[PDB]
């Protein structure tokens, strides 16, 4: 809803039935709040217009923030029934199936059955073969890419000049190399990750609101081959952040909402059997050795989540159209980065 | 056989995208050779050494396809990916901006002469029919045909040649008044009914594999695919009976105008296409089946004119921007020769 009637034309030419030759004035489009990278819109036929065929009365329009890998990835997942159906695809975005559901709330990530299912969902997604680069260059390649931008950017507002200067006073480039030493010496398999498994990217499916099999993972924009440790660590960090806050800065950070060791162990107890066929056949002692090594792994890679999304947020404070306290969020990520580095002593 | 000194790019792509033995392969133990047939893209076969054994799942040989010169880069990739997921094409192993790594399928391309074999011809038709009935996440408006012709023409009227013999050849082609002849062509096709379906757009013998140890065939290379008039896909395929791209001396193609399918052979093709595209078909009355076939005969032979015009222009564009060894200017004259020839046969 912004005088961009490209959404109407996209729907008219890409969708079958009633959508073909649907008059401009009879087109219903509204924004869907939530995402911090991409725009999302609902497109619908008027309730009175109801045609016979396979075609949907309601679709989604997603526009990319600021290419091929996300396109091809969405198609493949659509083809495997692992995501929504794909209706249209263009360089600027896509038209996808609207799925009756809602996004999870932050507080729901901690619920045992939810947590268990996300774990299993993530385990099976990690076991997929994808036509992408198998080298784990995403993690530090991305952080170097943002860091270069961060070190270039300047502001005009005195409040923001001060916020950026505090952030840079951590000597971010050295800090990045300390992280690189820590992480490159932490064993964690490269698997297809995714890199953003957040409440807002997990759908509670209506009807299936009973039984495992309640959820769907969506939004594979940041996906790539990566260290598994990152994918789980990033998820754990997401217990601390709630993006539904209504007032500025449009998020809340709660460090004491990070999962306990017992909560992490319950998650990885569902991850492992689903990721490794012969896990449940190991002895209790060998299982616990694996579990303890994994807790060290993911909590170290958790630091890369703070560092990466902290850097991302600073960059977004320049280039993003979305209203969100990006600077305040970057600082929140780095607060958590140093706090957690402290407790680990590494 | 042996690729150009930058076999190195091929090596680096294989090493990075392919799992198992490929990860630990040295540049000195990398096997690769060029495959010569295509006129858009370049193609290579890459292999592990025979002495090298796999660490399980991974392919021992793959195909590297590199895009040629001629938004559509997205559609091309998504299309290959979707077909691989459906088992309507080779598996996708790697995708990157300049091309892809794909399953090497044990097989060979068809020869020009094989297109007329009744069994080969029937299957091509059944195959094309089932592709035509697919739903794809692309634009459903038939803008491809004339959008593409207006595109190649805009460039054709802009290009200028350094060499003198190719200055004469272009001048001759331009003296047909192509901007005006395109509007002639547009008018004729506008009043020709033809179902909009997902079209392959380049169904030649070189994009059809005869599968080893053999339902004998597989349609491949969906680069030009889009929503388009059904008549063009079939019309284009009929034109392909006349053209042989395996000639080994200049201009590296042979045109035989006498090899266009007869009405008998055209009828045999569409008699296989139809029952595979229309659920009702074989139940229909004899009278009604003839009407549909006879209307289809007119439909496809009018759209065959778009095949000659479209590829004639394409071939001129390729004469300034393509790096493949081919007589692009000679090819363009042959297609426009065939266009007026066909325009006469139709009395249009
Ligand atoms: C929220 N985040 C900073 C972890 C990821 C980017 O936002 P989104 O694209 O997942 O909304
Ligand atoms: C052969 N053609 C001229 C009809 C189309 C372009 O060549 P190719 O891309 O199918 O090899």
Curated annotation (Swiss-Prot), chain A:
Domain of life (superkingdom): Eukaryota
Could you say what the effect of mutating residue 137 to R is?
A: Abolished acetylation by KAT5, leading to prevent conversion into a tyrosine-protein kinase
Q: Which GO terms describe its biological process?
A: CDP-choline pathway; cellular response to glucose starvation; lipid droplet disassembly; lipid metabolic process; lipid transport; phosphatidylcholine biosynthetic process; phosphatidylethanolamine biosynthetic process
Catalytic class of the enzyme:
transferase
Q: What is the effect of changing residue 57 to W?
A: In NEDMIMS; a functional model in yeast shows reduced choline kinase activity
A single GO CC term for this protein reads:
cytoplasm
Q: What is its main location?
A: cytoplasm
Provide the binding site for ATP.
33-39, 62, 97-103, 198, 219
Q: Which family does it belong to?
A: Belongs to the choline/ethanolamine kinase family.
Q: Tell me how this protein assembles.
A: Homodimer. Heterodimer with CHKB. (Microbial infection) Interacts with PI4KA/PI4KIIIalpha; CHKA bridges PI4KA/PI4KIIIalpha and hepatitis C virus (HCV) non-structural protein 5A (NS5A) and potentiates NS5A-stimulated PI4KA activity, which then facilitates the targeting of the ternary complex to the ER for viral replication.
Which disease appears in this protein's record? Answer: Neurodevelopmental disorder with microcephaly, movement abnormalities, and seizures: An autosomal recessive neurodevelopmental disorder characterized by severe global developmental delay, impaired intellectual development, microcephaly, early-onset seizures, and movement abnormalities.
* Primary role: Plays a key role in phospholipid biosynthesis by catalyzing the phosphorylation of free choline to phosphocholine, the first step in phosphatidylcholine biosynthesis. Also phosphorylates ethanolamine, thereby contributing to phosphatidylethanolamine biosynthesis. Has higher activity with choline. May contribute to tumor cell growth.
Q: Can you name this protein?
A: Choline kinase alpha
Tell me what organism the protein belongs to. Answer: Homo sapiens (Human)
| Shown residues within the full chain | 85 to 457 of 457
